[PDB]
Amino acid sequence: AKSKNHTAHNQSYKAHRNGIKKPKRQRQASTKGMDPKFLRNLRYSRKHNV
Amino acid sequence: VNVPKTKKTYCKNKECKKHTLHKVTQYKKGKDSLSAQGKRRYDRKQSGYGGQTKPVFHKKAKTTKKIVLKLQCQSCKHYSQRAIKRCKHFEIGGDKKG
Amino acid sequence: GRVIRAQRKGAGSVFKSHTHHRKGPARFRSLDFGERNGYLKGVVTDVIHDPGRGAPLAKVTFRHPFRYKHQKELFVAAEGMYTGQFVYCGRRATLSVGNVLPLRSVPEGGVICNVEHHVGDRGVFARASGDYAIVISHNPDNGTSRIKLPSGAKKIVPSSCRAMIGQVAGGGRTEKPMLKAGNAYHKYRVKRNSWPKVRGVAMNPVEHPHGGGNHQHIGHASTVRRDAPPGQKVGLIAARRTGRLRGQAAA
RNA sequence: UUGAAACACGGACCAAGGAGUCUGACAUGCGUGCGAGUCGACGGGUUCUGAAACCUGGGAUGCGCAAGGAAGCUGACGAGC
RNA sequence: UCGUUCGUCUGACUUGGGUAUAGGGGCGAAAGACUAAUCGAACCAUCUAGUAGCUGGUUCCCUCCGAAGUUUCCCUCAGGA
RNA sequence: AAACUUUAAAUAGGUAGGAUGGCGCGGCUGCUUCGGUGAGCCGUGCCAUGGAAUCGGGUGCUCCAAGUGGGCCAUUUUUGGUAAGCAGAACUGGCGAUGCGGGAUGAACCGGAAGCCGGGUUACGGUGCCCAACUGCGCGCUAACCUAGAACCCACAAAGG
RNA sequence: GUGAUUUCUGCCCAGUGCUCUGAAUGUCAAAGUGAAGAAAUUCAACCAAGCGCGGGUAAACGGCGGGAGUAACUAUGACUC
RNA sequence: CCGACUUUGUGAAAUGA
RNA sequence: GGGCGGAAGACAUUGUCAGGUGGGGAGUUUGGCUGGGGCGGCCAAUCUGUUAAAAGAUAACGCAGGUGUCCUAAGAUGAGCUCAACGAGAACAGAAAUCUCGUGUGGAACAAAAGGGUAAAAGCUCGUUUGAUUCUGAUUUCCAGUACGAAUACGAACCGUGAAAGCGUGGCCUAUCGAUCCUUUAGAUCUUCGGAGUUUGAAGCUAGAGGUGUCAGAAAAGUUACCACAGGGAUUACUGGCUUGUGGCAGCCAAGCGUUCAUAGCGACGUUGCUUUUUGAUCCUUCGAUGUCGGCUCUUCCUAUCAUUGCGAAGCAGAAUUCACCAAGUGUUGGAUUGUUCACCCACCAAUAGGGAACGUGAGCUGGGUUUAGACCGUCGUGAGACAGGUUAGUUUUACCCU
RNA sequence: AUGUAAA
RNA sequence: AUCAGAGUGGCGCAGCGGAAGCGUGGUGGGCCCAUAACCCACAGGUCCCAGGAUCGAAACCUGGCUCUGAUACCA
Ligand SMILES: C[C@@H]1C[C@@H]([C@H](O)CC2CC(=O)NC(=O)C2)C(=O)[C@@H](C)C1
Ligand SMILES: [Mg+2]
Ligand SMILES: [Mg+2]
Ligand SMILES: [Mg+2]
Ligand SMILES: [Mg+2]
Ligand SMILES: [Mg+2]
Ligand SMILES: [Mg+2]
Ligand SMILES: [Mg+2]
Ligand SMILES: [Mg+2]
Ligand SMILES: [Mg+2]
Ligand SMILES: [Mg+2]
Ligand SMILES: [Mg+2]
Ligand SMILES: [Mg+2]
Ligand SMILES: [Mg+2]
Ligand SMILES: [Mg+2]
Ligand SMILES: [Mg+2]
Ligand SMILES: [Mg+2]
Ligand SMILES: [Mg+2]
Ligand SMILES: [Mg+2]
Ligand SMILES: [Mg+2]
Ligand SMILES: [Mg+2]
Ligand SMILES: [Mg+2]
Ligand SMILES: [Mg+2]
Ligand SMILES: [Mg+2]
Ligand SMILES: [Mg+2]
Ligand SMILES: [Mg+2]
Ligand SMILES: [Mg+2]
Ligand SMILES: [Mg+2]
Ligand SMILES: [Mg+2]
Ligand SMILES: [Mg+2]
Ligand SMILES: [Mg+2]
Ligand SMILES: [Mg+2]
Ligand SMILES: [Mg+2]
Ligand SMILES: [Mg+2]
Ligand SMILES: [Mg+2]
Ligand SMILES: [Mg+2]
Ligand SMILES: [Mg+2]
Ligand SMILES: [Mg+2]
Ligand SMILES: [Mg+2]
Ligand SMILES: [Mg+2]
Ligand SMILES: [Mg+2]
Ligand SMILES: [Mg+2]
Ligand SMILES: [Mg+2]
Ligand SMILES: [Mg+2]
Ligand SMILES: [Mg+2]
Ligand SMILES: [Mg+2]
Ligand SMILES: [Mg+2]
Ligand SMILES: [Mg+2]
Ligand SMILES: [Mg+2]
Ligand SMILES: [Mg+2]
Ligand SMILES: [Mg+2]
Ligand SMILES: [Mg+2]
Ligand SMILES: [Mg+2]
Ligand SMILES: [Mg+2]
Ligand SMILES: [Mg+2]
Ligand SMILES: [Mg+2]
Ligand SMILES: [Mg+2]
Ligand SMILES: [Mg+2]
Ligand SMILES: [Mg+2]
Ligand SMILES: [Mg+2]
Ligand SMILES: [Mg+2]
Ligand SMILES: [Mg+2]
Ligand SMILES: [Mg+2]
Ligand SMILES: [Mg+2]
Ligand SMILES: [Mg+2]
Ligand SMILES: [Mg+2]
Ligand SMILES: [Zn+2]
């Protein structure tokens, strides 16, 4: 009747039975959040490639 | 907490857009108006039988408010307003600390 | 709660007046020309005990003023009346115990009973056993008079209101202790269902504002306001004061 | 129910009745028809066993084909690693 | 309800019949008593298959996969997302 | 010395171990620098014996949805409690959901997880009778005139003679 | 409300309640009044009952304290603060 | 309980406009 | 004389609005956690240290504490200086007033709680100030990788200070706070009022404030013994079970008592246990019911032995008495008072020892107590009512089944 | 307010 | 058992950080033959024990104590 309960018992099992899903490493890694001063330049060069 | 009467901050008006000199005041809630849509709705709803229909607040807990400072720049006569942290005593242009 | 006895008495259910053996309305005569402007001679025939009323009634057999028949009227006996007496009605009736005169004809200081209030409403003040009204004073510029009622109040009445001179019989009756719940019961059968009367403090809350509690007590001020809704106005109504009456307040 | 053979509850026995259905909106999955269209659903004509079937209208009925705005309003200038 | 034993018995006594008051109403020498074996709000029918986060039941076979009592929020801890 | 620390373990934590790598050439920039200076990108050409062991198809991507959200026991770390078959946590496993062999009997102690059969061999535990297997081969101690003593948990014994 | 007879009903009107008075310059609705307004409207003045101010009322509901010292044996405390 | 409007007419004075 | 006779008289009164009163009446509410619940407390928001087992996460009504503030400086920055303390000295002047020199790793201060950080500073004094500003995103912390709070790092402005580098989007860092609807405010020389306009009003858009502390945010007091329902052994009071602090019972040591003599008989200071008739603790079974104190009756069992049979010891001369041994075969009473178990007295006795069996024993009784509804007092409550205060009256159902 | 017991 | 309250002059009580008084008692005089009473002056305290902050405590808060008062229920 003690409504406060807490364990991590069985939580490693639930985590690992379907693996700890690592994200697929990526060619062309994402730029979102990067330094806008760096990204404006980076975009503008690709604007003026030949 | 003391705050100066006149302060230099940013004035966003398309005429100023720079730090100007702003006179300070204290925000006080203007008076409730009898023709606001919420008021003609509530006055329609309260009318009749059934008594108090919209809830009315009783369990007050705060003792202090957030001051709002109504800063008017001396350059285009347009206000802009800033809320400061919660305080009990508040005074504009008090005698400076020594 | 539920409806409270003070509220149940207005229904008429069992609280009506127990009037099966009462001898009829005890009142004066229908005021007419003869008794406006002279006197009519009537003779008492019997002093009959009226059930449910302490004052005896006197059967008075007038002669009808303008048709050929008797009129058995029925008065409230003034202490002194006897069978065979001639009672005279009118304005020029001599000031004799038993005669009925308008107040324009009772000298100041005189005792009267059965005083009318609107000339011809046939007697309303000073009627119960052994009570009388004294004509204090007259005012002929408005044609009115003043009387001291039994209650100690002082009422201006029309100077043409009639009155029976004397005092009502049966006086001194409420001096005798009844000594018995039996006597009390036989008193109240013939008046109305108003006895035995239960203390509110010994009631449950659902039927009396004083009700309930592990001890018997009222629990709140027993003096209630004049406007309190029916069913709340029980206790001492609109009381100006309480406690034993001492000094001037006992006047 | 964490724990039932329980000193936990229901149950004497048999027969029959007896409990996730039907409807409106939506959603994913699948099948079928057609496919920038698709729906014929309310109506009309016909129907010789027929409350069925079959035909008809739509050139704007619904959904879709165009979105952003609170509203005035504006509305996709043609892709590279 | 029965038995022996008890209270009262000219009295505010006992009782028949007629009649009055019918439900948040009646009546009460007051116990929330009595109002047809029903009264701290009768009975009857209807709204009504009222609602229940609670208890009980929830009916055929084989095959294969097959857990949770843990995080976070909720007048939330017998519940739900 | 839990709310002290110079020092400072063990177990446990993170990252890297190449084809998602480098070097040349010639181009862009609205960034950067005193500046072809850098930063990055862009096009192209070259290389790069696969860059410790072992193992092996993958949640790789998504949709719809069920039940659950009362836990309990054990070895070890551990908080309150005098302690509890008590209350609360940490790592893992078990029971719950699971039979089967052993511990006489037991949900979670020991062995071990399973289609239905024939044959062989074992684990835990045992070989005096119940009861399948030795009254086997050896060596010591105990003699209990108290119910000697006789299974991991486990059904206790203490200070002391 | 108390509950025959006898005897007697001490103190408190600050609390709660009841009740009485309104000089009037506290508070106070609709209506009606004036001003501004182009009008909706806003404003101000006026403004009843009620409260608020002021008296009474306990056989109205109710209530009725502490702390120290002191007698020429001790104790106790007539007395005192 | 109280105020205003209403049924609600007729005319007289005193203070206010 | 076209008045039936009076009384009041355009006031009462009818009708409708308007204000106050209105448990007389209606409706409803009366939070959660909790070693039952109530009361207490806030362990509901939330910070620091520890528990937290050397990454992270980690609970309890665990421990020690904090917060709902304060601040135009106690914010920004630049310059300059060194703080607590200690040694020696100096008129009045001393332990302590002010001054000077030396040493001074921070033993000071930094608004507050604790922890961390700092010595040409983050501290002290002075200088100029307002970055405590504007727009909208990102990221972390919580975490569902949602919101909020807070914080960080860029971007585009405008600025402060410094000669400059730079620093600066509030306080040295870690807590100091607020959703929807509504009202109110700021802004564009913005949009709509849908017949077109002028022109007040109203709604909009973006950003603020007014607050929900039960702090992801209902608008809300009690009582019930007259009570009702759906349920619960997720949860109390009886029994039993684990535990045994508390209760009872026994050892070891030996400082002393025992007139000289620790141990005849004790045995403090400590300490080791045993038991499960009390109570505490828990909440495992039982809430679609296990009949709940006591007495009466009857039986059985235990030994931790009071008496009785045999013995040992003595501070045993005889009598009595005390300690222990195998011993549980036999015995253990009549009564006053109390509902009592317990207790206490009177008397007899060889003795009036202690204990269990669902605190043995209610289809065995009794119903005194307790534990419904009546009623009374005392305290509490404004009250309906409460009392682990005293009082009085208060139904005791079935066996014929199996053993 | 008051006035040795000590003659 | 917890929750509060108050501890201040010999006594009973005031007290809002600059910090000690009210009534009564004590002391020396005066009036009196004398004592009161009265008149004029005089001395007062470990602000319950140990801390902390705090320009600055007796007060704010925290530990150590004594007396007093409260709520201690359903079984
Ligand atoms: C006094 C006001 C009250 C409150 C708000 O009006 C209550 C409303 C909000 C809601 O949830 N719906 C309602 O009908 C009640 C609010 O906004 C605060 C800032 C301050
Ligand atoms: Mg849970
Ligand atoms: Mg209305
Ligand atoms: Mg009667
Ligand atoms: Mg009477
Ligand atoms: Mg009476
Ligand atoms: Mg009663
Ligand atoms: Mg009532
Ligand atoms: Mg009562
Ligand atoms: Mg009372
Ligand atoms: Mg269970
Ligand atoms: Mg069992
Ligand atoms: Mg059962
Ligand atoms: Mg059940
Ligand atoms: Mg059955
Ligand atoms: Mg069937
Ligand atoms: Mg179409
Ligand atoms: Mg491609
Ligand atoms: Mg009988
Ligand atoms: Mg009769
Ligand atoms: Mg009859
Ligand atoms: Mg009946
Ligand atoms: Mg159904
Ligand atoms: Mg039903
Ligand atoms: Mg769910
Ligand atoms: Mg070391
Ligand atoms: Mg770790
Ligand atoms: Mg490593
Ligand atoms: Mg085999
Ligand atoms: Mg064999
Ligand atoms: Mg009285
Ligand atoms: Mg009586
Ligand atoms: Mg009295
Ligand atoms: Mg009064
Ligand atoms: Mg009073
Ligand atoms: Mg008005
Ligand atoms: Mg008035
Ligand atoms: Mg009510
Ligand atoms: Mg209700
Ligand atoms: Mg609760
Ligand atoms: Mg509790
Ligand atoms: Mg919450
Ligand atoms: Mg850690
Ligand atoms: Mg500096
Ligand atoms: Mg976020
Ligand atoms: Mg910057
Ligand atoms: Mg600072
Ligand atoms: Mg709004
Ligand atoms: Mg229009
Ligand atoms: Mg807000
Ligand atoms: Mg109750
Ligand atoms: Mg009752
Ligand atoms: Mg249980
Ligand atoms: Mg023990
Ligand atoms: Mg003990
Ligand atoms: Mg239990
Ligand atoms: Mg039960
Ligand atoms: Mg039984
Ligand atoms: Mg023995
Ligand atoms: Mg039995
Ligand atoms: Mg009884
Ligand atoms: Mg009772
Ligand atoms: Mg009682
Ligand atoms: Mg004297
Ligand atoms: Mg003197
Ligand atoms: Mg003297
Ligand atoms: Zn400006």
From TrEMBL, chain A:
Basic residues composition-biased segments: 14-27
Ribonucleoprotein among keywords: yes
Record-level GO BP terms: cytoplasmic translation
Chain positions recorded as Mg(2+) binding sites: 5
GO molecular function list: structural constituent of ribosome
Cellular component GO terms held in the UniProt record: cytosolic large ribosomal subunit
Region (Disordered): 1-50
Keywords assigned by UniProt, alphabetized: Metal-binding, Ribonucleoprotein, Ribosomal protein
UniProt family annotation: Belongs to the eukaryotic ribosomal protein eL29 family.
Protein name: 60S ribosomal protein L29
Originating organism: Triticum aestivum
Chain's gene name: LOC123129241
Residues of the full protein shown: 2 to 51 of 60
UniProtKB/TrEMBL annotation, chain B:
Annotated Gene3D superfamilies: 3.10.450.80
UniProt keyword annotations, A-Z: Metal-binding, Ribonucleoprotein, Ribosomal protein, Zinc
Protein origin, superkingdom: Eukaryota
InterPro entries in the cross-refs: Ribosomal_eL44, Ribosomal_LSU_eL42, Ribosomal_zn-bd
Region of interest: Disordered: 27-55
Pfam families per record: Ribosomal_L44
Entry-linked SUPFAM superfamilies: Zn-binding ribosomal proteins
Binding site for Zn(2+): 11, 16, 73, 76
Keyword Cytoplasm found: no
One term under GO cellular component: ribosome
Gene Ontology process terms (BP): translation
GO MF annotations, alphabetized: structural constituent of ribosome
Family named by the database record: Belongs to the eukaryotic ribosomal protein eL42 family.
Name of the protein in question: Uncharacterized protein
Native source species: Triticum aestivum (Wheat)
From TrEMBL, chain C:
TM segment ranges: none
Database matches in SUPFAM superfamilies: Nucleic acid-binding proteins (SSF50249), Translation proteins SH3-like domain (SSF50104)
Ligand binding (Mg(2+) 4): 212, 217
Record gene name: LOC123102523
Chain segments carrying region Disordered: 209-229
Keyword entries, A-Z: Metal-binding, Ribonucleoprotein, Ribosomal protein
Residues annotated to bind Mg(2+) 3: 210-212
Name recorded for this polypeptide: Uncharacterized protein
Gene3D superfamilies: 2.30.30.30, Nucleic acid-binding proteins, Ribosomal protein L2, domain 3
GO terms, molecular function: RNA binding; structural constituent of ribosome
Lineage per the UniProt record: Eukaryota, Viridiplantae, Streptophyta, Embryophyta, Tracheophyta
Family of this protein: Belongs to the universal ribosomal protein uL2 family.
Residues where Mg(2+) 1 binds: 193
GO biological process: cytoplasmic translation
Positions that bind Mg(2+) 2: 197
InterPro entries reported in the protein's UniProt record: NA-bd_OB-fold, Rib_uL2_dom2, Ribosomal_uL2, Ribosomal_uL2_arc_euk, Ribosomal_uL2_C, Ribosomal_uL2_CS, Ribosomal_uL2_dom3, Ribosomal_uL2_RNA-bd_dom
